[PDB]
Amino acid sequence: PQITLWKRPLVTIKIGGQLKEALLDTGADDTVIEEMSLPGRWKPKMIGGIGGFIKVRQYDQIIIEICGHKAIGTVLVGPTPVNIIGRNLLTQIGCTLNF
Amino acid sequence: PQITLWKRPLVTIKIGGQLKEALLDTGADDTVIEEMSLPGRWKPKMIGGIGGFIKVRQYDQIIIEICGHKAIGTVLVGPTPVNIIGRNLLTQIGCTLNF
Ligand SMILES: O=C(CC(c1ccc(F)cc1)c1ccc(F)cc1)Nc1cccc(F)c1CC[C@H]1CN[C@@H]2CCCS(=O)(=O)N1C2
Numbered sequence A, B: 001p002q003i004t005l006w007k008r009p010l011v012t013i014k015i016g017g018q019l020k021e022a023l024l025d026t027g028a029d030d031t032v033i034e035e036m037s038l039p040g041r042w043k044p045k046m047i048g049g050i051g052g053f054i055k056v057r058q059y060d061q062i063i064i065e066i067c068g069h070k071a072i073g074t075v076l077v078g079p080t081p082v083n084i085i086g087r088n089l090l091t092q093i094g095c096t097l098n099f
């Protein structure tokens, strides 16, 4: 689909069998979601935002569906204000910016 | 153009007579630029995101040139770690997400 930007580009994602709302964010290097349980081991990671840095948990090779498109990749879990789909997964679903 | 997302979508912008590098950010509702002088009235505002909040100066009806396209809108000026072009200006240049 073609998504205009008059409103937030919010989509439904499915992760761990649950539906959640997330924002398609070209300004985010990686994907970060609010607290939830994910399988496997995690690694430490620091990500920087407008307000400063936060610690997150990095989970690898996580199955995630984005607006019905199947992706498998890195998902960070932490104190984010909104669920964000970053470039690591936008590239998997073949998302580009056009003007 | 068609901008892929393997790397950060950085573009050159012209604002208040100055050339700056800025990130095309679909997750940002509005444009945020690092400390600089802009003409006219302004109002203080606090904006939040990953890492917390920053205090900014909200300037209205600011002209910005992005990839040769002139756009007018609100520009928030403050201690952001990167200049970000938000949806308020991306809509004006006809920028869409496509997948
Ligand atoms: O990708 C970056 C780093 C990036 C940067 C690039 C050039 C630089 F030289 C320095 C760092 C950056 C940092 C702050 C920022 F405001 C924009 C980009 N962080 C990140 C990584 C993973 C997930 C994530 F949600 C973020 C954060 C994205 C931002 C921007 N899109 C949304 C819009 C509201 C602001 S935010 O900070 O909450 N946020 C979500």
Ligand SMILES: O=C(CC(c1ccc(F)cc1)c1ccc(F)cc1)Nc1cccc(F)c1CC[C@H]1CN[C@@H]2CCCS(=O)(=O)N1C2
Pocket: A023, A050, A081, A082, A084, B027, B028, B029, B030, B031, B032, B046, B047, B048, B049, B050, B076, B086
């Ligand atoms: O938009 C947010 C705050 C927002 C959020 C969401 C859920 C929460 F529990 C808490 C904060 C958020 C954070 C990260 C993200 F990736 C996307 C959105 N900040 C921001 C970041 C960068 C640029 C920018 F102009 C803004 C400010 C946008 C304004 C206008 N439009 C809305 C309207 C209410 C006023 S406001 O000043 O907060 N604001 C949001």
Ligand SMILES: [Cl-]
Pocket: A010, A011, A012, A013, A066, A067, A068
């Ligand atoms: Cl959706």
Ligand SMILES: [Cl-]
Pocket: A072, A073, A074, A088, A089
């Ligand atoms: Cl990944």
Ligand SMILES: [Cl-]
Pocket: B072, B073, B074, B088
């Ligand atoms: Cl505006």
Ligand SMILES: [Cl-]
Pocket: A004, B094
């Ligand atoms: Cl349009």
